[PDB]
Amino acid sequence: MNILSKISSFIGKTFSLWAALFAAAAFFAPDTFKWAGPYIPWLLGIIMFGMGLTLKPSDFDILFKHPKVVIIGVIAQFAIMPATAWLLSKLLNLPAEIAVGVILVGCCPGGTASNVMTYLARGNVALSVAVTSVSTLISPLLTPAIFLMLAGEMLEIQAAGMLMSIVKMVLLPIVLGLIVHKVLGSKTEKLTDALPLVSVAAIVLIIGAVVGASKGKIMESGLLIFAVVVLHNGIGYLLGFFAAKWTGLPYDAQKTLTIEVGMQNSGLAAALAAAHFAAAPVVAVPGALFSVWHNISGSLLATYWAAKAG
Ligand SMILES: CC(C)(CO)[C@@H](O)C(=O)[O-]
Ligand code: NA
Numbered sequence: 001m002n003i004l005s006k007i008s009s010f011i012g013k014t015f016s017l018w019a020a021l022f023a024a025a026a027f028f029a030p031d032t033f034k035w036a037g038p039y040i041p042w043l044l045g046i047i048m049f050g051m052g053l054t055l056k057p058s059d060f061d062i063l064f065k066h067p068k069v070v071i072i073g074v075i076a077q078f079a080i081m082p083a084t085a086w087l088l089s090k091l092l093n094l095p096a097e098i099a100v101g102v103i104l105v106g107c108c109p110g111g112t113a114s115n116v117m118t119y120l121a122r123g124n125v126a127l128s129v130a131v132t133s134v135s136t137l138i139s140p141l142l143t144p145a146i147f148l149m150l151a152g153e154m155l156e157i158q159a160a161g162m163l164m165s166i167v168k169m170v171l172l173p174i175v176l177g178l179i180v181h182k183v184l185g186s187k188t189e190k191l192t193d194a195l196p197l198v199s200v201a202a203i204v205l206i207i208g209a210v211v212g213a214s215k216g217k218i219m220e221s222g223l224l225i226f227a228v229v230v231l232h233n234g235i236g237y238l239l240g241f242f243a244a245k246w247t248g249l250p251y252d253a254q255k256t257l258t259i260e261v262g263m264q265n266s267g268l269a270a271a272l273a274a275a276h277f278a279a280a281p282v283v284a285v286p287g288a289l290f291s292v293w294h295n296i297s298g299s300l301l302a303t304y305w306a307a308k309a310g
């Protein structure tokens, strides 16, 4: 069974219980998220382990047979979102450590959630999986590279350390997912049945941990960070659509790259912020809020297209 049909079905069927569990957790057991703070890199690693657990060599066919459509998506990813974050930081003159967190999100690759949103938007799913996989696999070099170029003068770099952080949090769990898939063969369908549950649980723990650990600066700047997230996410959609349109790509691919650009692996941003900016928790907040908003705006954008398709 397609993992994207498993994920959307799981969310659509239990979105209420998650909203109630988070609510009761943040109010009657705030420790649930504070205790998970030091495990944000592992929680993300679990998410990426899922991507690798479901990735098959067939998902790269469109790359090897239609390289130019995939190359456009990867270029549009790293050409739009890093620069967009930098511009929003300067035009709004954000605090230094908030701008670093916003730029950090922009320099990350596309989000793994775009595959489901493209599936829900009825775009080119094969393209969505390809661009996200390519951008993710080359992010150990591009994400720290672009990140220091756009925010170098704002803080220390440790670009080499961030590369290894992405290798351990992204490449290694993906590789583990691939070999676990090879070892178990068909028995992996039962492990992927629990992937929607495990992934969502990890996603909410990461968000609540970052939020709860930075509630002082969220009170005074949280609304400003959300606004930046909405604009960053929205501008990515707009430019991702006009990028696919102006290059002459079909409508299904225009929806794919629209979702691909605007949506980010904001969990990686939060994990990198926790590992390389631990003494400045606010650096991780843009990734936490982005992780929330882009799934809201993504599903809403998919719903709009789903309605116009009739
Ligand atoms: C938080 C997350 C896992 C889903 O929104 C995001 O980092 C992504 O799409 O990869
Ligand atoms: Na994708």
Ligand code: NA
Residues within 6 Å of the ligand: 077, 081, 109, 110, 111, 236, 259, 260, 261, 262, 263, 264
């Ligand atoms: Na993106």
